[PDB]
Design an enzyme around this catalytic site. Structure first.
Site, PDB file in Angstrom:
ATOM      1  N   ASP A   8      -3.599  -9.256  -0.028  1.00 53.83           N
ATOM      2  CA  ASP A   8      -2.811  -8.604  -1.070  1.00 53.83           C
ATOM      3  C   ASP A   8      -2.619  -9.601  -2.214  1.00 53.83           C
ATOM      4  O   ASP A   8      -2.778 -10.829  -2.030  1.00 53.83           O
ATOM      5  CB  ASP A   8      -1.465  -8.125  -0.484  1.00 53.83           C
ATOM      6  CG  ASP A   8      -0.542  -7.503  -1.524  1.00 53.83           C
ATOM      7  OD1 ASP A   8      -0.989  -6.577  -2.247  1.00 53.83           O
ATOM      8  OD2 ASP A   8       0.654  -7.926  -1.575  1.00 53.83           O
ATOM      9  N   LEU A   9      -2.242  -9.108  -3.390  1.00 57.64           N
ATOM     10  CA  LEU A   9      -2.029  -9.984  -4.533  1.00 57.64           C
ATOM     11  C   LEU A   9      -0.536 -10.168  -4.811  1.00 57.64           C
ATOM     12  O   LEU A   9      -0.019 -11.271  -4.698  1.00 57.64           O
ATOM     13  CB  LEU A   9      -2.747  -9.482  -5.819  1.00 57.64           C
ATOM     14  CG  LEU A   9      -2.941 -10.567  -6.912  1.00 57.64           C
ATOM     15  CD1 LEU A   9      -3.919 -10.104  -7.987  1.00 57.64           C
ATOM     16  CD2 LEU A   9      -1.659 -11.025  -7.581  1.00 57.64           C
ATOM     17  N   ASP A  10       0.151  -9.096  -5.197  1.00 59.99           N
ATOM     18  CA  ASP A  10       1.511  -9.225  -5.720  1.00 59.99           C
ATOM     19  C   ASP A  10       2.460  -9.613  -4.597  1.00 59.99           C
ATOM     20  O   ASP A  10       2.523  -8.929  -3.574  1.00 59.99           O
ATOM     21  CB  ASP A  10       1.952  -7.911  -6.327  1.00 59.99           C
ATOM     22  CG  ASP A  10       0.993  -7.394  -7.410  1.00 59.99           C
ATOM     23  OD1 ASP A  10       0.589  -8.166  -8.316  1.00 59.99           O
ATOM     24  OD2 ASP A  10       0.646  -6.196  -7.360  1.00 59.99           O
ATOM     25  N   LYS A  45       6.924  -1.807  -3.259  1.00 55.67           N
ATOM     26  CA  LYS A  45       5.928  -2.861  -2.986  1.00 55.67           C
ATOM     27  C   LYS A  45       4.735  -2.262  -2.256  1.00 55.67           C
ATOM     28  O   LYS A  45       4.895  -1.517  -1.295  1.00 55.67           O
ATOM     29  CB  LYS A  45       6.553  -3.990  -2.157  1.00 55.67           C
ATOM     30  CG  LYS A  45       7.624  -4.784  -2.892  1.00 55.67           C
ATOM     31  CD  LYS A  45       8.148  -5.962  -2.058  1.00 55.67           C
ATOM     32  CE  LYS A  45       9.149  -6.834  -2.848  1.00 55.67           C
ATOM     33  NZ  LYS A  45       9.800  -7.851  -1.982  1.00 55.67           N
ATOM     34  N   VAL A  47       2.705   0.048  -3.114  1.00 55.27           N
ATOM     35  CA  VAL A  47       2.458   1.456  -3.383  1.00 55.27           C
ATOM     36  C   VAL A  47       1.751   1.623  -4.726  1.00 55.27           C
ATOM     37  O   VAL A  47       2.077   0.939  -5.683  1.00 55.27           O
ATOM     38  CB  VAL A  47       3.810   2.196  -3.363  1.00 55.27           C
ATOM     39  CG1 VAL A  47       3.671   3.625  -3.795  1.00 55.27           C
ATOM     40  CG2 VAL A  47       4.361   2.123  -1.946  1.00 55.27           C
ATOM     41  N   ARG A  49       0.382   2.901  -8.443  1.00 54.51           N
ATOM     42  CA  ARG A  49       1.176   3.041  -9.642  1.00 54.51           C
ATOM     43  C   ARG A  49       1.779   4.455  -9.729  1.00 54.51           C
ATOM     44  O   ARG A  49       2.964   4.617  -9.966  1.00 54.51           O
ATOM     45  CB  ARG A  49       0.327   2.732 -10.864  1.00 54.51           C
ATOM     46  CG  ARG A  49       1.123   2.620 -12.156  1.00 54.51           C
ATOM     47  CD  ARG A  49       0.245   2.492 -13.389  1.00 54.51           C
ATOM     48  NE  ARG A  49      -0.649   1.334 -13.274  1.00 54.51           N
ATOM     49  CZ  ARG A  49      -1.628   1.054 -14.109  1.00 54.51           C
ATOM     50  NH1 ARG A  49      -1.845   1.827 -15.176  1.00 54.51           N
ATOM     51  NH2 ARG A  49      -2.414   0.023 -13.888  1.00 54.51           N
ATOM     52  N   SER A 114      -6.034  -5.483  -3.049  1.00 56.08           N
ATOM     53  CA  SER A 114      -4.900  -5.116  -3.891  1.00 56.08           C
ATOM     54  C   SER A 114      -5.015  -3.705  -4.451  1.00 56.08           C
ATOM     55  O   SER A 114      -6.093  -3.246  -4.808  1.00 56.08           O
ATOM     56  CB  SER A 114      -4.762  -6.123  -5.052  1.00 56.08           C
ATOM     57  OG  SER A 114      -3.689  -5.793  -5.922  1.00 56.08           O
ATOM     58  N   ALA A 115      -3.871  -3.043  -4.543  1.00 62.73           N
ATOM     59  CA  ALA A 115      -3.735  -1.778  -5.244  1.00 62.73           C
ATOM     60  C   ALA A 115      -3.900  -1.900  -6.745  1.00 62.73           C
ATOM     61  O   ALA A 115      -4.005  -0.881  -7.434  1.00 62.73           O
ATOM     62  CB  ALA A 115      -2.354  -1.214  -4.972  1.00 62.73           C
ATOM     63  N   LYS A 145      -2.302   2.429  -0.070  1.00 63.90           N
ATOM     64  CA  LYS A 145      -1.357   1.979   0.937  1.00 63.90           C
ATOM     65  C   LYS A 145      -0.179   2.939   0.965  1.00 63.90           C
ATOM     66  O   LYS A 145       0.325   3.318  -0.095  1.00 63.90           O
ATOM     67  CB  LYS A 145      -0.881   0.561   0.629  1.00 63.90           C
ATOM     68  CG  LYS A 145      -1.982  -0.444   0.469  1.00 63.90           C
ATOM     69  CD  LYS A 145      -1.467  -1.808  -0.046  1.00 63.90           C
ATOM     70  CE  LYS A 145      -2.608  -2.715  -0.390  1.00 63.90           C
ATOM     71  NZ  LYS A 145      -2.160  -4.070  -0.891  1.00 63.90           N
TER      72      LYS A 145
HETATM   73  O1  LIG Z   1      -0.748  -3.098 -11.125  1.00 66.76           O
HETATM   74  P1  LIG Z   1      -0.885  -1.558 -10.847  1.00 66.76           P
HETATM   75  O2  LIG Z   1       0.207  -0.728 -11.545  1.00 66.76           O
HETATM   76  O3  LIG Z   1      -2.315  -1.106 -11.103  1.00 66.76           O
HETATM   77  C1  LIG Z   1      -0.569  -1.316  -9.039  1.00 66.76           C
HETATM   78  F1  LIG Z   1      -0.621   0.009  -8.774  1.00 66.76           F
HETATM   79  C2  LIG Z   1       0.723  -1.952  -8.575  1.00 66.76           C
HETATM   80  O4  LIG Z   1       0.516  -2.368  -7.247  1.00 66.76           O
HETATM   81  C3  LIG Z   1       1.612  -3.105  -6.654  1.00 66.76           C
HETATM   82  C4  LIG Z   1       1.209  -3.608  -5.336  1.00 66.76           C
HETATM   83  O5  LIG Z   1       0.158  -4.548  -5.379  1.00 66.76           O
HETATM   84  C5  LIG Z   1       2.885  -2.280  -6.697  1.00 66.76           C
HETATM   85  O6  LIG Z   1       3.987  -2.712  -5.878  1.00 66.76           O
HETATM   86  C6  LIG Z   1       3.194  -1.620  -7.933  1.00 66.76           C
HETATM   87  O7  LIG Z   1       4.262  -0.640  -7.802  1.00 66.76           O
HETATM   88  C7  LIG Z   1       2.026  -1.154  -8.695  1.00 66.76           C
HETATM   89  O8  LIG Z   1       2.312  -0.536  -9.958  1.00 66.76           O
HETATM   90  F1  ALF Z   2       1.169  -6.343  -3.807  1.00 64.40           F
HETATM   91 AL1  ALF Z   2      -0.430  -5.504  -3.741  1.00 64.40          AL
HETATM   92  F2  ALF Z   2      -1.964  -4.626  -3.623  1.00 64.40           F
HETATM   93  F3  ALF Z   2      -1.204  -6.697  -4.824  1.00 64.40           F
HETATM   94  F4  ALF Z   2       0.275  -4.264  -2.701  1.00 64.40           F
HETATM   95 MG   LIG Z   3       2.308  -7.178  -2.470  1.00 67.16          MG
END
Ligand SMILES: O=P(O)(O)[C@H](F)[C@@H]1O[C@H](CO)[C@@H](O)[C@H](O)[C@H]1O
Ligand code: ALF
Ligand SMILES: [Mg+2]
Length: 217
Positions: A8-10, A45, A47, A49, A114-115, A145
Site C-alpha cells: 500500500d502507499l498512503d 483509509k 477505500v 475515491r 495502491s488505490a 479494497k
Molecule cells: O488518491 P486517490 O483519490 O486516487 C485514492 F482513491 C485514495 O486512496 C486512499 C488509499 O490509498 C484513500 O484512503 C483515499 O480515500 C483515496 O481518495
Molecule cells: F493507502 Al492505499 F492504496 F495507498 F489504500
Molecule cells: Mg493506506
C-alpha cells in the site's frame, strides 16, 4: 520464503493518509457534513475515491446530483494534489527506503498495490519509482479494497503467487483485501484500529526484511 512484497502507499510508504484525511474533512465540511473525524476516517483509509465520497455522503444521509458528486470528488482531489506537491524523499517513512534496498538485494519482488491515481506521482516525488518491479494500475481492476483484486493484480504483475507474498497496509479495508487475496498481511498502526488477529507493528521502522522473515517463519 516469500517472493514478493505488495505495498500500500498512503500511510505505509509515506504520511499521505494524513493529507487524504485533511482533504476529505475539508470537503465534507464545505457541504455541511461534520462527522469526518479521525475515528470515522478509519473507514476512508484504503477505500477508493468514489467509495470514500459516498461514505461521507451516507454518514449524513445526504443526496447530491450526479453532476455535484463528480464535482465534489474532483474538488477534493484537486486540493489533495496541491497538498502533495512538496513531498520529497525526506518524507519517506522510516525503514521504507532501506526495506526496498534489502528486498532487491535478496531478489524479492516489489509491487505497488495502491488505490491511488496519485501513486505514480508520489513515487516520483520520493525517488522511489526505481525500486518497484510493478505498479498495479487501480483503474484496471473491477473491484477495489476491501476486495482483494488490487493485491492479486500486484502479485500477478511481478509473477508471484499471492500465497507467496506479504502485503503491507495501514487500513481496515486493505487488511481485509490482503486476507482475501491469499497474501500474508502485516499491518502498521494501532491494533485498536486494525485488529488483534494479525501481526501489527506501531510504525514502519519495524518493517525490516529481518522482521518480515521473522513473521514468515
Ligand atoms: O488518491 P486517490 O483519490 O486516487 C485514492 F482513491 C485514495 O486512496 C486512499 C488509499 O490509498 C484513500 O484512503 C483515499 O480515500 C483515496 O481518495
Ligand atoms: F493507502 Al492505499 F492504496 F495507498 F489504500
Ligand atoms: Mg493506506
Amino acid at each position: 520464503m516469500f517472493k514478493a512484497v505488495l505495498f500500500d502507499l498512503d500511510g505505509v510508504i509515506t504520511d499521505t493518509a494524513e493529507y487524504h484525511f485533511r482533504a476529505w474533512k475539508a470537503l465534507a465540511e464545505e457541504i455541511g457534513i461534520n462527522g469526518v473525524d479521525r475515528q470515522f476516517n478509519e473507514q476512508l483509509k484504503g477505500v477508493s475515491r468514489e467509495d470514500s465520497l459516498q461514505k461521507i455522503l451516507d454518514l449524513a444521509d445526504k443526496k447530491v446530483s450526479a453532476e455535484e458528486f463528480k464535482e465534489l470528488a474532483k474538488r477534493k482531489n484537486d486540493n489533495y494534489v496541491k497538498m502533495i506537491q512538496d513531498v520529497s524523499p525526506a518524507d519517506v517513512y522510516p525503514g521504507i527506503l532501506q526495506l526496498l534496498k534489502d528486498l532487491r538485494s535478496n531478489k524479492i519482488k516489489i509491487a505497488l498495490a495502491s488505490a491511488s491515481k496519485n501513486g505514480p506521482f508520489l513515487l516520483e516525488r520520493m525517488n522511489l519509482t526505481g525500486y518497484f518491479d510493478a505498479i498495479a494500475d487501480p483503474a484496471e481492476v473491477a473491484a477495489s479494497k476491501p476486495a482483494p483484486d488490487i493485491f492479486i493484480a500486484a502479485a500477478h504483475a511481478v509473477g508471484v503467487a499471492p500465497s507467496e507474498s506479504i502485503g503491507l497496509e495501514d487500513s481496515q479495508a486493505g487488511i481485509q483485501a490482503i486476507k482475501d487475496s491469499g497474501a500474508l498481511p502485516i499491518g502498521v498502526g494501532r491494533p485498536e484500529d486494525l485488529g488483534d488477529d494479525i501481526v501489527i507493528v506501531p510504525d514502519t521502522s519495524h518493517y525490516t526484511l529481518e522482521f518480515l522473515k521473522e513473521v514468515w517463519l
